[PDB]
Amino acid sequence: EVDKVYRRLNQEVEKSGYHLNPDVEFTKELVRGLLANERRYGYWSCPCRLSADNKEEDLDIICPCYYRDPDLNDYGACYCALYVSDEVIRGEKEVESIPERRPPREKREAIRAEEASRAEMMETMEFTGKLSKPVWRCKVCGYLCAMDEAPGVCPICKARKERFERFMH
Amino acid sequence: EVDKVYRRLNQEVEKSGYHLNPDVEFTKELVRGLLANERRYGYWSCPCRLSADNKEEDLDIICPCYYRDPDLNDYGACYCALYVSDEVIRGEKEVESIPERRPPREKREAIRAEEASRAEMMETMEFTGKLSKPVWRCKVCGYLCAMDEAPGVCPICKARKERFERFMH
Amino acid sequence: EVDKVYRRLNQEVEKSGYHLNPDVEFTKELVRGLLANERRYGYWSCPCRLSADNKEEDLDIICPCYYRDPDLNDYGACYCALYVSDEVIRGEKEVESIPERRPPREKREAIRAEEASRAEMMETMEFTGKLSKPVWRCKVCGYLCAMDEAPGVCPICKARKERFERFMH
Ligand code: SF4
Ligand code: SF4
Ligand code: SF4
Ligand SMILES: [Br-]
Ligand SMILES: [Br-]
Ligand SMILES: [Br-]
Ligand SMILES: [Br-]
Ligand SMILES: [Br-]
Ligand SMILES: [Br-]
Ligand SMILES: [Br-]
Ligand SMILES: [Br-]
Ligand SMILES: [Br-]
Ligand SMILES: [Br-]
Ligand SMILES: [Br-]
Ligand SMILES: [Br-]
Ligand SMILES: [Br-]
Ligand SMILES: [Br-]
Ligand SMILES: [Br-]
Ligand SMILES: [Br-]
Ligand SMILES: [Br-]
Ligand SMILES: [Br-]
Ligand SMILES: [Br-]
Ligand SMILES: [Br-]
Ligand SMILES: [Br-]
Ligand SMILES: [Fe+3]
Ligand SMILES: [Fe+3]
Ligand SMILES: [Fe+3]
Ligand code: NA
Ligand code: NA
Ligand code: NA
Ligand code: NA
Ligand code: NA
Ligand code: NA
Ligand code: NA
Ligand code: NA
Ligand code: NA
Ligand code: NA
Ligand code: NA
Ligand code: NA
């Protein structure tokens, strides 16, 4: 039907140094699957896995999935064998059985929640150091305050802004 | 009516080295506004801004607002020009148009939530290092435990409290 | 009735260098209390304190409680005087009145929530450094990526996996 998607994929991955399975009809088969999965669930859900029909919960199995590279590295193929390793293509690598590396649902949920908290921390802290203010010190009385710029005049001794200095530490 | 509040303000700010607008009637005008805003919303909501009639959401525009000092520094006046800069009062500073520095509602909410998380972290950690316990080491068997004081006797070898030592590291 | 529990306790604590009150009948009294509290609430709630009949909220007063050791250290006895200090048993230590060290309900709740946040941080961060990936660098073009192992081939220059190196810093 559409061979268009097969070929544009083959070129997309070859540029980046990955490889599709060299057997053509088995691969185009998987392509049909991916297409159908896109029609049915609205994302490219791994063609050889049960989709949960919820994108958020499947982000790890949208093709290419999070298991592809480790699986290529250990077994010479991704779980469906859509992709095969640079080693298999040539010789060595001996394309072989691939266990399911994806963790079970409960485990995945824990991992996500942990990545959520971790991202929130990093966000909050990055956003933080962005709004922090430098500390200014009056050179007459030593008054300290925290502002982008030193105040017009020291509320203590009245020295002008230009007589403050950035303070450390 | 009440000029009482005008004058007590003028003295309150002059002590700290800020200045009210030298035009008297324009300033007392703003004072009336602030008073009314206090009657209407129960806080001194910036007289030249739309109040949301919720204190929590307006903490940034209670007068004096969070934009006053940066605005004095850049434009020689706060957004309403209740306050004018030390430079304008004398010469230079050329009192000039002030854009609205306050971010729009969505932005403000994000910023607040980020300051909330940041404060929770800092709180939780400060509260944390306060309850942490030192580590005590039996000098006979090396048993380690974490308590304000070493135990009456080592549960391992039975050496008395006075034969423990603070441990590092 | 059951003296079984009295004696197994006396041996359990003596091994660890704690001591029960040497008056036998006052102690076995407290034992009966602890038993009853176990029948009534399903945990060994301090026999001389009001139980809230909720384990989660009483974790600090399950016997032995969190106040036992500090109380032994300062007063020579736990709050009920189930336990007496190594000093009292012999001489010195002068067993004496013990105030209630447990903080009031509101305080306890705050402390717990703070320990919760602190534990979540530590968990999230520990779980974090466990999933972080090393950074690999192509030795031909300097391409950087973060994975357990370097890719089959550099998506940039095509150098094979074995021509990458662990990168710092
Ligand atoms: S396993 Fe192969 S096919 Fe299934 S998603 Fe991962 S990469 Fe795409
Ligand atoms: S702008 Fe001027 S008047 Fe309005 S709140 Fe800030 S300081 Fe008070
Ligand atoms: S006070 Fe004494 S009896 Fe009550 S719980 Fe703490 S240790 Fe057990
Ligand atoms: Br079709
Ligand atoms: Br998608
Ligand atoms: Br990998
Ligand atoms: Br590869
Ligand atoms: Br497989
Ligand atoms: Br100046
Ligand atoms: Br400076
Ligand atoms: Br009036
Ligand atoms: Br107020
Ligand atoms: Br400023
Ligand atoms: Br000023
Ligand atoms: Br303005
Ligand atoms: Br001692
Ligand atoms: Br010591
Ligand atoms: Br009974
Ligand atoms: Br229990
Ligand atoms: Br202690
Ligand atoms: Br003791
Ligand atoms: Br007591
Ligand atoms: Br290789
Ligand atoms: Br290396
Ligand atoms: Fe000063
Ligand atoms: Fe010891
Ligand atoms: Fe390269
Ligand atoms: Na996607
Ligand atoms: Na599952
Ligand atoms: Na500032
Ligand atoms: Na200024
Ligand atoms: Na206020
Ligand atoms: Na707005
Ligand atoms: Na302690
Ligand atoms: Na003790
Ligand atoms: Na327990
Ligand atoms: Na209480
Ligand atoms: Na990896
Ligand atoms: Na590989």
UniProtKB/TrEMBL annotation, chains A, B, C:
Catalytic activity: [thioredoxin]-disulfide + 2 reduced [2Fe-2S]-[ferredoxin] + 2 H(+) = [thioredoxin]-dithiol + 2 oxidized [2Fe-2S]-[ferredoxin]
Keywords: 4Fe-4S, Disulfide bond, Iron, Iron-sulfur, Metal-binding, Oxidoreductase
InterPro entries to which the protein is assigned, alphabetical: FTR_bsu, FTR_bsu_sf, Rubredoxin-like_dom, RUBY_RBDX
Binding site for Fe(3+): C138, C141, C154, C157
Top-rank EC class of the record's enzyme: oxidoreductase
Signal peptide: none
Oxidoreductase found in the keyword field: yes
Gene Ontology terms for molecular function: 4 iron, 4 sulfur cluster binding; iron ion binding; oxidoreductase activity, acting on iron-sulfur proteins as donors
UniProt binding sites for [4Fe-4S] cluster: C46, C63, C65, C78
Domain Rubredoxin-like: 133-167
Listed EC numbers: 1.8.7.2
Disulfide bonds: C48-C80
Gene3D superfamilies (UniProt xref): 2.20.28.10, Ferredoxin thioredoxin reductase catalytic beta subunit (3.90.460.10)
Cofactor: [4Fe-4S] cluster
Job of this protein: Catalytic subunit of the ferredoxin-thioredoxin reductase (FTR), which catalyzes the two-electron reduction of thioredoxins by the electrons provided by reduced ferredoxin.
Family: Belongs to the ferredoxin thioredoxin reductase beta subunit family.
Protein name: ferredoxin:thioredoxin reductase
Organism (species): Methanosarcina acetivorans (strain ATCC 35395 / DSM 2834 / JCM 12185 / C2A)
Lineage of origin: Archaea, Methanobacteriati, Methanobacteriota, Stenosarchaea group, Methanomicrobia
